[PDB]
Write a protein that binds this ligand. Sequence first.
Ligand SMILES: CCC(=O)c1ccc(O)cc1O
Ligand SMILES: CCC(=O)c1ccc(O)cc1O
Lengths: 208, 208
Amino acid sequence: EVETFAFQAEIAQLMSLIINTFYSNKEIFLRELISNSSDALDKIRYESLTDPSKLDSGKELHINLIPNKQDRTLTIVDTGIGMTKADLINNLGTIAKSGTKAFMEALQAGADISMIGQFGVGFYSAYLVAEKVTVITKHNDDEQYAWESSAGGSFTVRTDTGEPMGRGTKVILHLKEDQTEYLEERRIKEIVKKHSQFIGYPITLFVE
Amino acid sequence: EVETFAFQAEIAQLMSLIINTFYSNKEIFLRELISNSSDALDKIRYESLTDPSKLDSGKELHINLIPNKQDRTLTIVDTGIGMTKADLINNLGTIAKSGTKAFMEALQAGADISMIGQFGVGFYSAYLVAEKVTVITKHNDDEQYAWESSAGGSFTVRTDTGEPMGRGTKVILHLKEDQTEYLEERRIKEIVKKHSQFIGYPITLFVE
Ligand SMILES: CCC(=O)c1ccc(O)cc1O
Ligand SMILES: CCC(=O)c1ccc(O)cc1O
């Protein structure tokens, strides 16, 4: 059923640093995740140029932001390329061992955490606001998996027996009890206007 | 021998706009190309995690900047993943039809040309300083090709019968007669310090 994995030592370190370093500009987490979704959307778009049957699983390419105040979650859904099980396990598709090394070396050279996505490890900036991230993903090659962590050096992967999604990745952020501002419609609008105003796919902010 | 292709109408338009729009901050072209090389280097690195024989063609991952004042060229060499012939033809691996659409829509909404790489069409910013770009590339799956354009709505692809390179892509910029500043060691250093100081692969500026 549930398989448990250890983060590579470097990714464990990165995460600890994101959770432990005092850093007020937490909002950048949404830019990082939107831009991840935008990159995955490019990949399914590039691939459908040569093989247009890859879109049999969803012809519409978009990003949705779903806050839910009861569950204290913000969900970023994209209909991008999705991850195989192998991708999930290899640090959600990233070059995370050397991306972290490069990042922790930019840090001790005049850079701040906001430059995280330049090293290809943006996803972990989710840990700025979330106490637990759950990642549901579906690639055309493979079945649907749920990936999950509350940091602490381990993550779980299970085949997700719940709701089919067709193709893409849903990042569910279970927010820290003091970061509920990121559930407010006004707050989300502002961040999307400020950090992601020129992203080439519809972004849709759901209402409650 | 030499096959000639037509740029897609949108890419033709983008290029014309890059060549024709008055825009003084031409230097951003080097940031765009370095960051393309860095992305390709990530791809061969991600792929060698699962299959370490993909590095049989070059174990070292780096970017080199080679000015040559006699030929009036600046060459950006990377040992990244390389392009197949198909990739070369599909707009050098980019989503260029819709990336341009997204870009030309950011333009008439408060954005300037420097935001070009956010739409995945950074490569064409080469036309800010070059009268002709020649692209030599080698992917592990395929042979070695030269791709070439002086804009005007057409590009050529030939199998490159010259010097083997092992794996990667070399972008040769044949500079406009008034943009030779980009051949100066001081000028290149400054741009690399200002726009690309935290890129996670060695960048080496060759000397003449
Ligand atoms: C591999 C690309 C992918 O599916 C993905 C990864 C991280 C993320 O925050 C969003 C995504 O869509
Ligand atoms: C497909 C990635 C690739 O080989 C490449 C493309 C454009 C570029 O300026 C440099 C590159 O290395």
